[PDB]
Amino acid sequence: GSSGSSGEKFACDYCSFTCLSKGHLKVHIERVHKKIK
Numbered sequence: 437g438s439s440g441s442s443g444e445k446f447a448c449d450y451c452s453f454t455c456l457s458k459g460h461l462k463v464h465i466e467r468v469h470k471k472i473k
């Protein structure tokens with residue numbers, strides 16, 4: 437069939453947070469983290 441490995445999506449590293457949209461991942465580390473070296 438087709439069903440098998442689900443996911444094929446990247447997630448934030450610093451934290452274990454899962455998003456729905458691609459942009460959400462960006463806007464996330466944008467402020468939620470904003471970790472300045």
Ligand SMILES: [Zn+2]
Nearest residue numbers: 448450451453
């Ligand atoms: Zn994060």
